Amino acid sequence: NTSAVQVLIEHIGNLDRAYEFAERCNEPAVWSQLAKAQLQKGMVKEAIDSYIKADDPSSYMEVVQAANTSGNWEELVKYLQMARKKARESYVETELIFA
């Protein structure tokens, strides 16, 4: 299961595919680096950020802050649920606060 997931890559997947082989795995990997690549290459995040959280990424800072203005609340508020969690200093919690 350490691959059936990250498969959501560029020349590796795309759209109604990337999130088609993620419900089978639990487990997985690449959550902070996948949000930076899936957010700068084709609109997805709303999808690639609503079927993974999986610990990381809480703030700081890029995806974290990003998700809030648009219009990602309902999942946004949950994205922090893990924040103060295996996590609790400034720039990261003062960020949760800020956030």
Report how far residue 6's alpha carbon sits from residue 33's, in angstroms, rounded to the nearest whole number: 10
- Residues 43 and 20: beta-carbon distance below 8 Å: no
Phi and psi for 91 in degrees, rounded to 5?
A: 50, -20
The residue to which tokens 């082989």 are assigned = 21
Q: What is the DSSP string of 48-87?
A: TTSS---S--PSSSHHHHHTTTSS--TTHHHHHHTTSTT-
Going by C-beta distance under 8 Å and a sequence separation of 6 or more, which residues neighbour residue 74?
Answer: none
Q: Tokens 């759209």 sit at which residue?
A: 15
CA distances 42 to 57, 70, 85, Å, are 20, 16, 31
Angle at 41 between CA 38 and CA 46, to 5 degrees: 45
Residue whose structure tokens are 């893990």: 82
Contact 50, 63 (CB under 8 A): no
End-to-end CA distance of the chain: 33
Residue 6 in tokens: 């990250």
> What resolution in angstroms does the PDB record give?
7.9
